[PDB]
Amino acid sequence: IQMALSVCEDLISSQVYAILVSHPPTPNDHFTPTPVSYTAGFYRIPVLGLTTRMSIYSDKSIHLSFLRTVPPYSHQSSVWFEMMRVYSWNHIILLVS
Amino acid sequence: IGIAVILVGTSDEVAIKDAHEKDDFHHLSVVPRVELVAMNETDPKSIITRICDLMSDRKIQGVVFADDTDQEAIAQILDFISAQTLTPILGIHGGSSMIMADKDESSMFFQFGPSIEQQASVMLNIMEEYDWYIFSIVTTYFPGYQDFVNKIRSTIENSFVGWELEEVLLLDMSLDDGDSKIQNQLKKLQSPIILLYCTKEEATYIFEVANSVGLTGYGYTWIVPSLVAGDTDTVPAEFPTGLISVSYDEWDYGLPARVRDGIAIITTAASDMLSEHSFIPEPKSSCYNTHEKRIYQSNMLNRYLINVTFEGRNLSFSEDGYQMHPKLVIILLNKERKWERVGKWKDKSLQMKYYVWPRMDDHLSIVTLEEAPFVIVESVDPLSGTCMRNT
Amino acid sequence: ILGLQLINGKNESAHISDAVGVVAQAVHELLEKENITDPPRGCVGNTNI
Amino acid sequence: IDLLIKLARTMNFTYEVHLVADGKFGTQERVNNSNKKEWNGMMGELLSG
Ligand SMILES: *[C@@H]1O[C@H](CO)[C@@H](O)[C@H](O)[C@H]1NC(C)=O
């Protein structure tokens, strides 16, 4: 609720340059980075993501002003290829949502 | 179901006010609460505040948003209200016109305007009509290129028409000192038709390199999507004459017209639920208490909100949330640095005024007569719209 | 299960030091050129990027 | 089929013979409602698994 307002009267009213996201208390949720990258996203105010594990904040077509200090879940595919590159695996079947 | 027509900027609210009040069909409870708040909703605080007091004051269950400025991501913040709440919101014009790539699974958003996939298919239809089968693609790291190329690639792959695709370039100005990194590859282009996908700001820059190499003037025809055009009035004076682009119709589909059909879509869809529900969904008249206000979910409305036909023309939205059959217009840059309308695209049909291309001396007409093995004419192929092979 | 995890990625308390390190060292070059603008003032008063 | 018998014995693999449905050797042809050329006959029965 307040996240929509949590940037106007208390964050960008105090001459902010960059905004640091929080970490949701429940790990299996992503409400935390959605509003900061929306209100400040179209304000051209960069937002740094320190606990944003989802891969949605990786296009910048939406969430234009967003930086992340942790690679998302989708980057696990980058190491997987190198992981089977050392075990010579070639016949794999992906099981994704 | 109250509908709040929200329009901001420098426009005519009375035209919206008069048109909205003239409900064509009274068989459904339109009850349009047209607040028409003219206050500039550019700031998030203005728009987010007014939405939940509009729902508080009038107990509305529907909003239609209109805008005049660019507002490249005012739909991004608008989608957040749709996701957090459950009241459908339909874009009309302005900052909600551009199609968002991906939204929330529960996003109650439906925009007016073709998607990138639709913009990729219409350009090919132009190419099919004029038989420019040989083409090349230049793109950037901008999102949607993985979809723009894929739509082109899928259509080209396994086709009766002998398409010729080569030299796919995936470099732009994002890389530092890229001036020497784009000239070497730009010299590899040889097709007369080049398909471009970039940003309007870099579109002028990317042509400056092309002009330096010499891929400009006559003999080369380039096609660009809607977002590259940006604004018809804003001509950067850098785009070459002959830049043919496709964009949503900003002239014919006027703002009073948009609300007329737009306000109809939500009313007929919501009233369809009341036939099978007999209970109008009532989200809490506030922008708080979302934990307890989301129990009475009305996602069944969304499942059939897309499939809606009004006055014969089907205004159905795609599942991703883009118009299925939009009224696209083809725009071309003449020699006077002004965008010129060419033709209209709808119902998978490409009809345009110029039956032949106005390119002109490398373009010489030839008059021939249908006689003998010297010249033979039999028919045209209507299955795909192309004439034939080896003819 | 040949699973996979990450190290030093959940140290959110220690993450901000690196998080502030890059931006603080980035404003040094930010305020080192011409026409360096000012961040938007307030919410309602400001109206554009 | 005789050549198949000698091919299977010297390769250690079991075979089940099933004929085509349409009965054509294989070619690429247009389909109604847009071009979308597809293989028919053996070739369609080999690329489709
Ligand atoms: C063929 O396979 C069978 C069992 O699978 C066994 O006789 C042997 O592995 C093979 N015989 C050959 C290659 O002669």
Side-chain angles (χ1 to χ4, degrees), chain A, chain B residues 1-11 14-16 19 28-38 43-44 46-57 60-70 73-75 77-146 148-163 165-166 168-171 174 178-180 182 184-186 189 191-232 234-259 261-278 280-283 285-287 289-290 295 298-299 301-302 304-310 312-319 321-339 341-345 348-391, chain C, chain D:
Chain A
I1 309 314
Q2 193 69 237
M3 301 325 148
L5 289 301
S6 79
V7 197
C8 287
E9 58 280 20
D10 52 63
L11 287 193
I12 73 192
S13 70
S14 41
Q15 195 76 291
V16 61
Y17 263 143
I19 276 182
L20 268 291
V21 306
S22 97
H23 175 57
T26 81
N28 45 8
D29 281 315
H30 65 91
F31 331 130
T32 282
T34 49
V36 280
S37 204
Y38 272 155
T39 76
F42 92 105
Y43 250 96
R44 183 34 194 63
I45 294 313
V47 190
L48 324 185
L50 60 94
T51 43
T52 77
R53 280 296 251 162
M54 301 275 198
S55 306
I56 174 66
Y57 332 112
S58 206
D59 57 83
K60 311 311 147 152
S61 74
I62 55 175
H63 312 70
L64 319 98
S65 312
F66 184 110
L67 260 279
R68 42 199 325 142
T69 88
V70 53
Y73 287 160
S74 286
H75 256 295
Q76 287 158 126
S77 35
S78 171
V79 62
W80 274 331
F81 176 112
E82 206 64 32
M83 167 137 76
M84 81 205 88
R85 196 48 55 234
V86 316
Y87 301 150
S88 86
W89 286 322
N90 96 87
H91 286 320
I92 83 189
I93 42 186
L94 276 143
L95 263 82
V96 293
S97 324
Chain B
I1 297 110
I3 319 295
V5 183
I6 314 163
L7 68 151
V8 308
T10 71
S11 72
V14 51
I16 308 296
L28 303 183
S29 66
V30 54
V31 60
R33 214 90 51 202
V34 305
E35 211 87 4
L36 319 169
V37 290
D43 54 307
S46 53
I47 166 63
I48 67 189
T49 36
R50 58 191 62 183
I51 287 284
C52 62
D53 61 61
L54 273 155
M55 216 140 48
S56 95
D57 293 356
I60 61 171
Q61 279 87 21
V63 279
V64 279
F65 193 91
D67 173 29
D68 300 355
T69 183
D70 176 29
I74 213 56
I77 183 57
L78 267 192
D79 185 31
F80 189 81
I81 291 101
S82 72
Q84 265 43 59
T85 69
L86 298 107
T87 280
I89 170 175
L90 288 90
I92 286 162
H93 158 262
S96 88
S97 290
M98 45 306 294
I99 280 304
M100 287 224 320
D102 314 307
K103 326 168 195 157
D104 197 59
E105 42 153 10
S106 47
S107 168
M108 270 316 80
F109 211 43
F110 304 95
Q111 320 202 250
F112 283 162
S115 67
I116 174 151
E117 301 94 321
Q118 323 269 346
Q119 277 135 15
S121 197
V122 54
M123 301 173 311
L124 279 199
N125 269 8
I126 278 150
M127 266 174 68
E128 292 239 78
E129 171 144 334
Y130 296 149
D131 319 274
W132 312 335
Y133 309 138
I134 165 62
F135 60 89
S136 284
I137 289 166
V138 290
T139 195
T140 168
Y141 331 117
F142 202 104
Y145 91 97
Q146 285 255 322
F148 178 85
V149 175
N150 257 8
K151 172 55 101 148
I152 296 302
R153 209 92 78 165
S154 311
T155 314
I156 296 310
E157 171 69 57
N158 227 330
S159 153
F160 150 80
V161 199
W163 301 98
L165 158 81
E166 80 276 355
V168 183
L169 310 187
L170 203 173
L171 284 313
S174 291
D179 42 300
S180 309
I182 62 201
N184 50 303
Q185 44 186 44
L186 221 50
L189 294 183
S191 165
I193 324 291
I194 312 296
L195 285 178
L196 196 135
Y197 182 44
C198 266
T199 288
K200 183 178 179 180
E201 289 333 330
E202 52 168 0
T204 70
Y205 165 79
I206 206 72
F207 176 65
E208 285 278 72
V209 187
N211 210 308
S212 64
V213 183
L215 300 197
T216 171
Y218 277 37
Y220 271 46
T221 315
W222 290 29
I223 312 141
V224 279
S226 172
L227 75 99
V228 172
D231 170 46
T232 86
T234 309
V235 171
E238 192 44 63
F239 301 146
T241 292
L243 213 29
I244 168 176
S245 187
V246 51
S247 304
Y248 202 46
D249 159 83
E250 211 180 357
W251 310 263
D252 167 68
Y253 219 94
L255 260 293
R258 294 204 194 187
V259 56
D261 57 70
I263 212 159
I265 270 176
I266 168 157
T267 39
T268 178
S271 293
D272 198 9
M273 322 335 279
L274 204 60
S275 312
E276 277 79 12
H277 207 161
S278 305
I280 175 187
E282 218 302 293
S285 293
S286 76
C287 47
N289 201 15
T290 39
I295 52 183
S298 188
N299 289 359
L301 164 62
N302 160 73
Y304 327 122
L305 211 161
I306 41 180
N307 168 45
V308 153
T309 310
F310 160 81
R313 45 187 189 283
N314 50 331
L315 283 86
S316 68
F317 304 97
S318 178
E319 288 80 354
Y322 52 91
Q323 288 213 249
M324 293 269 308
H325 316 86
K327 166 30 173 59
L328 299 85
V329 287
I330 295 93
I331 199 92
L332 166 79
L333 185 55
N334 69 345
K335 53 205 85 75
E336 284 82 13
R337 284 302 197 254
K338 45 159 71 64
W339 286 109
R341 314 213 302 179
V342 170
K344 38 190 291 311
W345 193 89
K348 328 297 149 289
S349 70
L350 172 89
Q351 164 55 17
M352 36 176 40
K353 156 188 48 166
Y354 297 143
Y355 44 79
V356 295
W357 204 235
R359 188 76 48 94
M360 284 271 129
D361 318 286
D362 250 9
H363 210 186
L364 315 183
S365 166
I366 286 90
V367 159
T368 175
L369 187 83
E370 210 281 335
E371 273 273 46
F374 299 126
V375 152
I376 286 165
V377 176
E378 68 298 344
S379 81
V380 75
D381 168 90
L383 329 172
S384 90
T386 54
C387 216
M388 221 65 88
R389 84 300 181 271
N390 312 126
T391 47
Chain C
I1 287 303
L2 179 33
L4 206 156
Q5 250 189 342
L6 91 167
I7 52 183
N8 91 97
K10 197 45 67 182
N11 236 10
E12 63 185 342
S13 313
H15 262 297
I16 69 145
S17 63
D18 295 81
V20 304
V22 277
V23 51
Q25 89 177 43
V27 309
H28 221 187
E29 37 265 31
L30 155 69
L31 290 109
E32 254 208 332
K33 282 95 64 183
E34 48 257 9
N35 35 25
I36 301 316
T37 48
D38 186 82
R41 284 326 288 124
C43 192
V44 186
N46 215 274
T47 173
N48 34 37
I49 277 176
Chain D
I1 284 317
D2 219 327
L3 164 66
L4 172 61
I5 312 303
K6 184 62 167 192
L7 192 46
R9 298 193 308 118
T10 70
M11 281 265 298
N12 231 323
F13 83 112
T14 307
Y15 58 104
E16 42 184 356
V17 196
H18 95 84
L19 297 200
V20 277
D22 39 9
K24 308 311 193 314
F25 275 95
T27 186
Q28 242 191 348
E29 80 292 337
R30 296 190 49 176
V31 48
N32 37 292
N33 325 320
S34 84
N35 40 64
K36 290 334 273 170
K37 297 157 138 256
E38 64 271 305
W39 287 96
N40 66 330
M42 278 158 185
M43 282 286 118
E45 284 186 1
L46 173 60
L47 305 148
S48 178

